[PDB]
Amino acid sequence: KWTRSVKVPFPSVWHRFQAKDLTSQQLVWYRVQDLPEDRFEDAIRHMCDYFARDELMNQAKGLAKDLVAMGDVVALWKAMLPDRMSLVCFREGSDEIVGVNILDVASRSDKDNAQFNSAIFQAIYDTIEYVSHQANIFDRYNVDHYLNAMGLSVDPKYRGRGIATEILRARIPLCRAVGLKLSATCFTGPNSQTAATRVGFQEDFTITYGELARVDQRFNYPGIEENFCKYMSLRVD
Numbered sequence: 001k002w003t004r005s006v007k008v009p010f011p012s013v014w015h016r017f018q019a020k021d022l023t024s025q026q027l028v029w030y031r032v033q034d035l036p037e038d039r040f041e042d043a044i045r046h047m048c049d050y051f052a053r054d055e056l057m058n059q060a061k062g063l064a065k066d067l068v069a070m071g072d073v074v075a076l077w078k079a080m081l082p083d084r085m086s087l088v089c090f091r092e093g094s095d096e097i098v099g100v101n102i103l104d105v106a107s108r109s110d111k112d113n114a115q116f117n118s119a120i121f122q123a124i125y126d127t128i129e130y131v132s133h134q135a136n137i138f139d140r141y142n143v144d145h146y147l148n149a150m151g152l153s154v155d156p157k158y159r160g161r162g163i164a165t166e167i168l169r170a171r172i173p174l175c176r177a178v179g180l181k182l183s184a185t186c187f188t189g190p191n192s193q194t195a196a197t198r199v200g201f202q203e204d205f206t207i208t209y210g211e212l213a214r215v216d217q218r219f220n221y222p223g224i225e226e227n228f229c230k231y232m233s234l235r236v237d
Contacts, residue, residue, distance in 0.1 A: 106147075
């Protein structure tokens with residue numbers, strides 16, 4: 001089982017960038033860094049407040065109003081956080097979470113047969129897993145591990161600033177530091193796909209939610225049937 005070495009500084013700052021401040025025409029500095037343990041719950045809440053509400057698949061399934069499905073995704077995130085790989089964005093001058101990306105390491109031996117309480121999250125999970133399996137990352141790149149993710153959340157009052165892009169860009173030094181060659185992720189909506197593209201991720205596999213529903217009845221996403229679900233990969237180093 002892959003583990004992050006304790007010799008890598010923690011928490012480390014991985015990336016810094018300038019973007020529009022909350023109000024003005026003025027730039028300000030932001031950073032992307034390791035998520036400190038004492039901000040774990042804050043991160044979880046941020047994920048519930050925004051990502052759960054706004055991301056395409058979740059919205060199409062009504063996830064944010066469903067307590068059992070929310071309990072599923074939160075259980076998952078909470079299992080992932082102790083790997084110490086998750087990333088958070090702060091604006092210089094403020095301790096408030098701007099964005100967060102819950103990350104872990106996918107390994108060749110993983111069965112990914114996770115079982116959840118809600119039909120809703122089981123369907124989301126199994127959909128991503130189907131897409132991941134079609135992506136065939138381990139054999140395609142001849143690797144045993146890659147940096148994966150289960151959601152990138154950005155506070156709406158900071159959107160339009162390129163924050164998602166920069167949070168993804170931070171994967172590059174993080175992977176170099178922990179010795180991973182590759183990150184891959186299922187990007188579920190148009191702007192997240194745009195962000196990943198701008199960082200240099202390549203499309204591994206793409207398929208509409210309509211087509212996914214033709215693959216398996218459970219993979220039904222009311223209202224986003226023509227949108228694409230894309231597995232995308234980035235070689236670092």
